[PDB]
Design a protein around this ligand. Structure first.
Ligand code: NA
Ligand code: NA
Ligand code: NA
Length: 223
DNA sequence: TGTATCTT
DNA sequence: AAAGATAACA
């Protein structure tokens, strides 16, 4: 079915044979059979399809997917045309235009162009029941996305991790703070953006850190 | 009504 | 665990 990127499957397929993951996917399937679950099944792992795992430079970690129709498509905070940017993404764009002087609102919500540059656009929980934020927490996704973070922590060098919100910040303990850069702030949702996201300057700080590590910076305007 | 984080 | 409070801004 070509839903998992090859390089990701190579390093993460060990999780597929573990009971927690088997039982997790059974739970999601039972949810789909009685409720609407987002994103659609072929888009749960879009974040594996945008770049090689060895080419990841930045990890943006959010909480869980958008819970409204036609919004989530497997890249955190992104929406496919023609759906308008949800409030969280409008807040991201709004921080981008104060933080990055060249950034202007791109007129859509598809962040695939960041992912193609090596920005991993991950959520801690990768499915959600329609209309109920974080309804699929504590079911097994956190152990899977822990394995993602742990692989990058151990096999990469000089990554920038942006942990947005309390649930994403639970991954901080798994990251070697002397070998990677961890920036943390509040979630960009309107319900929390006022607790630090506006003013966090994570996008310029990310490029500063990449620069100093001798890596190419993210062109936040490309997407 | 719609989109987190804290307290009990 | 979860209801309700707190929070801000359409
Ligand atoms: Na297990
Ligand atoms: Na479904
Ligand atoms: Na999403």
């Amino acid at each position: 079915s070509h839903m998992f990127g090859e390089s990701w499957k190579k390093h993460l397929s060990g999780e597929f044979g573990k009971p927690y993951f088997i039982k997790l996917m059974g739970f999601v399937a039972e949810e789909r059979k009685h409720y609407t679950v987002y994103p659609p099944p072929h888009q749960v792992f879009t974040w594996t399809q945008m770049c090689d795992i060895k080419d990841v430079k930045v990890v943006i970690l959010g909480q869980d997917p958008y819970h409204g129709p036609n919004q989530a498509h497997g890249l955190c905070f992104s929406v496919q045309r023609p759906v308008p940017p949800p409030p969280s993404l409008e807040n991201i764009y709004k921080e981008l235009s104060t933080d990055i002087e060249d950034f202007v609102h791109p007129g859509h919500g598809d962040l695939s162009g960041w992912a193609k540059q090596g920005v991993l656009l991950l959520n801690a929980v990768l499915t959600v029941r329609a209309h109920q934020a974080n309804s699929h927490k504590e079911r097994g996704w956190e152990q899977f996305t822990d394995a993602v973070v742990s692989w990058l922590n151990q096999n990469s060098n000089g990554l920038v991790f942006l942990l947005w919100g309390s649930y994403a910040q639970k991954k901080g303990s798994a990251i070697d703070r002397k070998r990677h850069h961890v920036l943390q702030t509040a979630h960009p949702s309107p319900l929390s953006v006022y607790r630090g996201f506006f003013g966090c300057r994570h996008f310029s700080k990310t490029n500063e850190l990449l620069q100093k590590s001798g890596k190419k910076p993210i062109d936040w305007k490309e997407a």
